[PDB]
Amino acid sequence: MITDEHIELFLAQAHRYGDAKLMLCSSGNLSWRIGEEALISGTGSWVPTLAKEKVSICNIASGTPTNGVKPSMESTFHLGVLRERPDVNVVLHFQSEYATAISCMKNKPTNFNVTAEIPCHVGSEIPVIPYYRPGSPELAKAVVEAMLKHNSVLLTNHGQVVCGKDFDQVYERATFFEMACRIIVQSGGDYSVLTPEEIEDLEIYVLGK
Amino acid sequence: MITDEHIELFLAQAHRYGDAKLMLCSSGNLSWRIGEEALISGTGSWVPTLAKEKVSICNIASGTPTNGVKPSMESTFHLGVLRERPDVNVVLHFQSEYATAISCMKNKPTNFNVTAEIPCHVGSEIPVIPYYRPGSPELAKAVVEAMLKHNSVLLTNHGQVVCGKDFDQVYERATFFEMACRIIVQSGGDYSVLTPEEIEDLE
């Protein structure tokens, strides 16, 4: 069913995330649901300059590759999220600049709501997962749990994961996740946040949009 | 009398603001006075990659679109500013790197005049508006009030706004606003400013 048309668009999106510097070289991975199957970046591949030859196809329900190309060593949480979240179509694990700095900090933010776009796009709460070996079962299980009700998670000493309806939403979510972290580091940690009431107020603004 | 030439210039100019990273994705908004009407970026549109289909033509006096494109929320302060400032033709709400860091700071700097370029282009005095919901009447009130006699404004916990007679003046004004903030942060807070006398001398 899936044509080279979808695989070409997947490729350009992977490059687009690489041009935005959401990940460097061989860290991070991407997936995209088309019907009963998903496109996932191949293990050990560079998402910025991605493949074509190293694009894996798996069945979402029994996540074994059908195209005979080995998937991301982290495909378990990619596909897990997709089984879990019927509304989600793209998952991006990346490794941003300031957001990775923060993921490695001993004193992490309790509150990332520094501008309106953060609670609106990234989520009003950002679950933080402790360090697990990349590709470890324990990691997949935590991400899947974290992403049942959240679109954005911080992996400590690793990077971050984001998901959404399409490539643009995922791009938007990734960039603002990065921007929140940039504000926090660059302000020197002495910032103020939106009030709970004020984040609820935004519903009216989101409606109008 | 909006030709496509007007709209194409608006699109190109939106794009150059995006290339400078004055805003990211769907944050910020841009407006341009052309006679009795104004071009405004459409609500929800991404201004760095705008978007012929998402440009609003609005009557300045009334605020209502004529081309089927829903204008930016916050069209209320843009049109507010154009009505009170006949000299102003472009208004940009943006959200750049170091200036937004300053936006969210609990203890803001009180003096931004760190090079000659700041008092010249940005203004010797930058009004700081508290946080109000984007698009809200309270925000419109503050922004319009602050921009009667200033061209540059800091929106707490949000971003910044700039005024100008044209696109070049706005681009420069925004770039130096950001530069002033970049200096403050990179210096680590321990910076000196031009004296009041020295700013008065800049004439």
- Establish if B43 touches chain A: CB-CB under 8 angstroms: yes
Tell me which method was used to determine the 3D structure: X-ray
Cβ-count burial B115-140 (b if 16+ within 10 Å, e if not): eeebbbbbbbebbebebbbbbbeebb
Q: What is the CATH number of domain B2-203?
A: 3.40.225.10
User: Looking at residue A53, what DSSP letter applies?
Assistant: T
B182 CB-near residues (< 8 Å, 6+ apart): B97, B98
- State the resolution, in angstroms: 2.5
B71 burial type by CB count under 10 A (0-12 exposed, 13-18 middle, 19+ buried): buried
Q: Return the residue matching tokens 């200096």.
A: B183
CB contact under 8 A, A115 and B157: yes
Helix, strand or coil for residue A102? helix
CB contact under 8 A, A117 and B185: no
- Looking at beta carbons, which residues of chain A come within 8 Å of B73? 205, 208-209
Is the peptide bond prior to B38 cis by the omega test (within 30 degrees of 0)? no
Helix, strand or coil for residue A154? strand
Contact yes or no for A58/A38 (Cβ under 8 A): yes
Identity of the residue numbered A1:
M
Of B136, B135, B181, B133, whose CA–CA distance to B154 is shortest?
B181
Contact yes or no for A77/A145 (Cβ under 8 A): no
Q: Return the residue matching tokens 């991404």.
A: B46
d(CA A85, CA A81): 6
A115 CB-near residues (< 8 Å, 6+ apart): A179, A180, A183, A194, B27, B95, B100, B103, B104, B157, B158, B159
- Establish if B157 touches chain A: CB-CB under 8 angstroms: yes
Smallest Cα distance from A176 to chain B, Å: 8
d(CA A35, CA A13): 19
CB contact under 8 A, A193 and B157: yes
d(CA A80, CA A142): 11
d(CA B59, CA B35): 9
- Residues B114-120: contacts with CB within 8 Å, 24+ apart? B114/B180, B114/B183, B114/B184, B114/B191, B114/B192, B114/B193, B114/B194, B115/B179, B115/B180, B115/B183, B115/B194, B116/B194, B116/B202, B117/B176, B117/B179, B118/B176, B118/B179, B118/B180, B119/B194, B119/B199, B119/B202, B120/B202
Helix, strand or coil for residue A61? coil
E-only strand ranges, chain A: 29-34, 37-41, 55-59, 90-94, 128-129, 152-155, 159-164
The CATH T-level fold of domain A2-209 is L-fuculose-1-phosphate Aldolase (3.40.225)
d(CA A156, CA B73): 37
Alpha-carbon Rg for chain B in angstroms: 17
Smallest Cα distance from B132 to chain A, Å: 8
Residue A33: alpha-carbon gap to chain centroid: 14
What number of other Cβ atoms are within 10 A of residue A157's Cβ?
11
Residue A143: alpha-carbon gap to chain centroid: 10
Of B89, B97, B73, B74, whose CA–CA distance to B10 is shortest?
B89
Identity of the residue numbered B67:
N
Residue A190: alpha-carbon gap to chain centroid: 27
CB contact under 8 A, A114 and B185: no
| Residues written for chain A | 209
Cβ-count burial A97-133 (b if 16+ within 10 Å, e if not): ebbbebbeeeeebeebbbbbbbbbbbbbebbebeebe
Nearest CA in chain A to B134: A205
d(CA B13, CA B30): 10
d(CA A23, CA A177): 13
